[PDB]
A paper describes a structure:
The final atomic models of wildtype (wt) [name] and the [name] MMD mutant comprise residues 476–5148, contain >80% of all side chains and were resolved at an average resolution of 3.2 Å and 3.1 Å, respectively, with the best-refined regions reaching 2.8 Å. We concentrated our analysis on the human [name] founder mutation, the most widespread disease variant present in more than 2.0% of the East Asian population. Cryo-EM analysis of the equivalent [name] mutation in mouse [name] indicated that wt and [name] proteins have an almost identical structure and can be aligned with a root mean square (rms) deviation of 0.69 Å for 4308 Cα atoms. Arg4753 is located at the end of an α-helix, fastening the ends of an ‘omega’ structure formed by residues 4750–4809. The [name] mutation disrupts this salt bridge, weakening the sealing of the omega motif and leading to small but significant structural adaptations in its immediate environment. Interestingly, mutating the Arg4753 partner residue Asp4806 is also associated with MMD, highlighting the relevance of the identified structural motif. To functionally characterize [name], we performed ATPase and ubiquitination assays. These data indicated that the MMD founder mutation, though causing local structural changes, does not significantly alter the enzymatic properties of [name] in vitro.
[name], also known as ‘[name]’, is the major susceptibility gene for Moyamoya disease (MMD), a cerebrovascular disorder characterized by arterial occlusions and abnormal blood vessel generation. Notably, with a mass of 591 kDa, [name] is the largest E3 ubiquitin ligase in the human proteome.
Author numbering:
A (entry chain A): 475 to 541, 591 to 855, 863 to 955
B (entry chain A): 4731 to 5150
C (entry chain A): 3472 to 3626, 3636 to 3867
Write the structure that this text describes.
Amino acid sequence: XXXXXXXXXXXXXXXXXXXXXXXXXXXXXXXXXXXXXXXXXXXXXXXXXXXXXXXXXXXXXXXXXXXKLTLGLSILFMVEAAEFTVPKKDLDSLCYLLIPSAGSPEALHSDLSPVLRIRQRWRIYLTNLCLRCIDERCDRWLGILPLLHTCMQKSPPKKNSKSQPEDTWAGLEGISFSEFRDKAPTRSQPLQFMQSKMALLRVDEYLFRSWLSVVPLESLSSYLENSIDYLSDVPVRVLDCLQGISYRLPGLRKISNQNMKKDVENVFKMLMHLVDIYQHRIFGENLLQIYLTECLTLHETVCNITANHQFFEIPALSAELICKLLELSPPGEKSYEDLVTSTLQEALATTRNWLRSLFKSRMLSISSAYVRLTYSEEMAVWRRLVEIGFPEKHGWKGSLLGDMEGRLKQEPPRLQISFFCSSQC
Amino acid sequence: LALQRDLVKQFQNVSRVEYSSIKGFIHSHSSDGLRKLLHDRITIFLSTWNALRRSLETNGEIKLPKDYCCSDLDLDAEFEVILPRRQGLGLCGTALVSYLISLHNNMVYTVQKFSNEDNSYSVDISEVADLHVISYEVERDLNPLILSNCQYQVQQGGETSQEFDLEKIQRQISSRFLQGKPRLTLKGIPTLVYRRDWNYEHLFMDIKNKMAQSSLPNLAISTISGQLQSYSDACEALSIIEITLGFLSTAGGDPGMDLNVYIEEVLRMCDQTAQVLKAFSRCQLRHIIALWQFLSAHKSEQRLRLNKELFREIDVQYKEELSTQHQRLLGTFLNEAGLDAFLLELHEMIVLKLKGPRAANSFNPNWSLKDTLVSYMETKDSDILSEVESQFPEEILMSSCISVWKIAATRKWDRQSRGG
Amino acid sequence: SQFLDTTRLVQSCVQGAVGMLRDQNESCARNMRRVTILLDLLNEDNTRNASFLRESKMRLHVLLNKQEENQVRSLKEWVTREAANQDALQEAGTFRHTLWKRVQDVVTPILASMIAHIDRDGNLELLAQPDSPAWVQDLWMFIYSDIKFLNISLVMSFILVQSHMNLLKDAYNAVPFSWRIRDYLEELWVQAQYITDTEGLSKKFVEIFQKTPLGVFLAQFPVAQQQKLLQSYLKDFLLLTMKVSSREELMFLQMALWSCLRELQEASGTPDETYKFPLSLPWVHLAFQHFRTRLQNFSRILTIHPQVLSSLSQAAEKHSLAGCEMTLDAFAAMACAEMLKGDLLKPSPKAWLQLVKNLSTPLELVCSEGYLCDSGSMTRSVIQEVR
């Protein structure tokens, strides 16, 4: 009823501090609109409804003739009582009042700070907005994501899972996106928003990460090819691509269908594409070790989610990626020598363990006077994983071929020869 | 001091601080009020530094290098200057606090020397507050105090003289601002210990202070050297004795009756083997430092006689071979020599004072081995120095200390093996 | 998992972990007592020792996981790395004993690094004293089982186990983790002071503490535990904040701060929403922030002229003192002035003047204008007698 009007006017007058002639006159016009709607009133479902109708008329004039941050913040503080139950469609509008349009610098949100000065109350207002409009529209709440990333701390430079999960990295921390990005494929529409509102990436340091954390895996390589224009300006965000892919994989199970194999194949080919477009300017100001540790972690992860022994393309790509980062790296010194040696050691360790994991209990079995491989794509696995080019002074040539020779020599010489002239070798 | 207590409370680590600047440290806090309080305390720190950063270079007792006291520190400076260490770049905060304590204490001392003649009121620096420090202002405290004591005087003949009564001003300053203050002891100065492992010399000094320590019996040496002829047993015995000397550093016990029966099986030790304890059977607790050096030299000479590399942590700076006439003088020393004490003490000096890199800052490999050996033995004034170490060749250098110990130990093993 | 006897492993690493610990050089070094306590309560004789096992193994689990994330993958395979370490194989004898000593060497400094975090100011005796009350061990095992409340970080070395209270001869604390609760409440104080202006700061600080997980643990106690907890936290708060060079000086400062609490709980007229939590740990911090200058003046009086203590020991029996109003600074003032009254010139004519000059500034501060903010009539009457 009209007992929350005194508290609303008091807190809006508190909001008149650290503003300029915006929220106080809004409080006065709200009081005048309430007094105008006081003619022949009704129960408490009428007062909030008429005040929301006046706020919706103000928002219609705010998005029709002049097309606004303070108006959306004030409507957040008004609708904290959740007045828009049947006016749920107004979620299309309020989010539009909160996308920082023409708000391109981060210094601009440093300038539009003090209307939302204290950084914990409007953070939970904006977060309850994001969790609320995440229903069967859920396309515009990403435009809020600049605002509540100016209501929190700086960006974590440490790598994947050594200090932070999904939430601390992407900067969401209240939103259950891990269930939302694994859905029936009817949610390409967010990237359509990300296709148009891409200029918002100069606002944040989190929006690239959070946007990587919302897109489905079948649509992420498109997100990787639309982001070439932004990553041209700032070429250290390839590391954010690697962390955002090594975050999505271990939450995914074993790769079981051809679509998921093709999706992670496109993602790895686009990571290679983004690597060999630019330079070791990707490796700027000595960021190499995090790239190598990140792609070793990505290799260990993506070797653990393939077991079908015909999906060798995916660890093959994740070892060609560590190949590309080692061949495109700048040599200075001895520390670089130790780094490339160690990185190649643990990559071959992961590769050999994966190979001994999915090649089990014999190599070639006959059973019908028709000797053949029991793993029908086994020689393709060995050709692909040996014929990728690491440097010669390291391993990868003696070790993997020695593994294959040891696997073949477990067969009797009558059958080791009979396969060799059976039109499959 | 609130700043430095908070930082010691937060950063009691070594080589861990991942912050470039002070702005990198203030802005890394999630809560805003803690960030504001931290910024205010660092602002007070930097203003007080920039005030005193030339009296510290001259009048302070913490002699700090001139790279520190030359520039005006602002929030873009290094994070290390607000941490209270005692080595480098964090001597700024320690020197500042020491200089303010010296200012306060010399003022309190002059006040007491004048009139009070003694005072035992002395609070610690880990609990100072606003009412323990000499605190005044100049606008609202000293200028009215001086103006109320500039007395005017007009004679009949006609003039107007000003005059300060200096005793009244001394009394009012010494009464309002300087009396009732403690003498701030330097007891709980906030600091980071900056160090992982301090070496065994101070620990052996602590055991020698808390306890009585004698040499091993000649029967006990035979018992220990008989029971752990295996290598793994000697390694286990040395591990146990190192754990127990870590405990007997911070405490003590009866030098008689070693802590086997009353601690090392009833206080849940529960793990050690039989022949190690049968070596330790004929020992007491006045036989711990001697047992440590016996077991360490024993482990090294068993590494020797089984043909393994036997120092491996001492750098190559002290590991070069003797030449011919050097080892002829060594051999004519070793003919008349107490080998079992000489190589024991020499191995002690090697494994305590020579630990690889940056040891030639104090243990130059161009000295004479005799003089540095008798200096190392006279630091703790041993009776082991009384033997044939005065008959050592005075021209053997410290570059060949390891090979002298190998020649002496190989001669000991050849005697006790070819004889019996 | 039954791949390794972890309880026997921890029991074997106890002595090597406590032997890495150093106090602050005069604190009646507690390594033998830590060994005796930790070997008496790393068993499963009870369900209390079993709780200490489950959470000690959980803290080892999380600290070893946080160590292994920065570990490279070649050092993360500890058995394969240990079969190639020829010197460790050769110093341990067999291969089992090599693997077991490797796990000893990994777990021992981590275990030392957590003993240095849950022992300081003598916290392990509250877990190990006979018939300590159930709220003590429940609060101990609550704060110890909470990862983000009590943050343990990582460091053949020396770990400094730093003492905050600097207590008397075996005067270990009475609340389980007094320093951590004191630091936690100061963090909430600075946060609530930044948020709320200085009119509802008491309400906001009490309600912020009641919404927090330690506050909602302490609210589940019945009242007879909460009163014991509040008294013990007054004692530990004064040991953490001030330094008492007596036990009677501690009891007078405890009476003083308790009467300050009861004065601030009667300053507001009739709220009856925040006095629904009167036995709450933020009230100690509120009382000290509102009466800091008088408490430090009173301890300065007890420090300069200690012979007033016996006189206060009469005056308490004259008054049944420390009610609902802070007066101990005033009665210490009056007793010091009465002692200087009776002693005219008796040690010497000079040493009497020395006692007067030593007690000048606290007595002139006590009977001054900006000293007593708002007290009752009887405190001001004692101040008139002191004047």
